[PDB]
């Protein structure tokens, strides 16, 4: 079908956080996960469409932190919303971008935001160029929000939020397709010297 687009999740892995060595200050970023990307978060319709993705985080927002991801290509710091993983002392901050590398990392610091095209955050009629899929890049960093014990800590799998597919084609827009944005759970290690 022309509008038979279906969602697929985009996921990032707790297991890529390096060991956290502590030689304190809260909040502070304790490491970045390896950024991930999915070209086909929405895919499958036979008719090309102008599409955009609205990300709504759905974990509790604890506060803000200023940061500049080592990954991505922003040259100045931004405020990021710190989201509660549920594990005391541990939050995450999120950035998302369009799939293609020229598009910028968008700090998640609003109750919802268009991750691609960023033009849509100030132009309600802006969409990606017409094509047959919508994808994205996902960036996450862990934040110490309080004192961490030594040793291993398990992070549960968390749904960071969802991307709503919007389009200037009503039949596709009105499906309100949504794709989950996932933090795959895992184990981190703190070495408190
Ligand atoms: Cl993925
Ligand atoms: Cl992909
Ligand atoms: Cl950044
Ligand atoms: Cl969850
Ligand atoms: Cl239409």
Numbering used by the authors: 21 to 43, 48 to 217
Verbatim from the authors:
Ucl fimbriae are attachment organelles that facilitate ExPEC adherence. Ucl fimbriae are phylogenetically related to Uca fimbriae from Proteus mirabilis and F17/G fimbriae from enterotoxigenic E. coli (ETEC). Tip adhesins are two-domain proteins; they possess a C-terminal pilin domain that connects the adhesin to the main fimbrial shaft, and an N-terminal lectin domain that mediates attachment to specific ligands, therefore dictating host range and tissue tropism.
Given the close phylogenetic relationship between the Ucl fimbriae and the Uca fimbriae from P. mirabilis, in parallel we also determined the crystal structure of UcaDLD (84% amino acid identity to UclDLD) at 1.6 Å resolution. The model was then used as a template for solving the structure of UcaDLD by molecular replacement. The final UclDLD and UcaDLD models contain residues 21–215 and 21–217, respectively. Electron density was not observed for residues 43–48 (UclDLD) and 44–47 (UcaDLD), suggesting that these regions have a disordered or flexible conformation in the crystals. As expected from the high sequence identity, the two structures are similar, with r.m.s.d. of 0.6 Å for 189 equivalent Cα atoms. A search for structures similar to UclD and UcaD in the PDB using the DALI server revealed significant similarity to F17G like adhesins (Z-score of 14.3–15.8 when using UcaDLD as the search model), although the sequence identity is only 14–16%. UclDLD and UcaDLD have a completely conserved pocket in the same region of the structure as the N-acetylglucosamine (GlcNAc)-binding site in F17G. The pocket also contains a tryptophan residue, which is known to mediate CH-π stacking interactions in the interaction site of other carbohydrate-binding proteins. By contrast, UcaDLD bound specifically to ten glycans from the glycan array, all but one of which, surprisingly, were different to the glycans bound by UclDLD. Binding for UcaD showed little direct overlap with UclD, with the highest affinity binding identified for UcaD being to neutral glycans containing GalNAc on the glycan core and sulfated Galβ1-4GlcNAc structures.
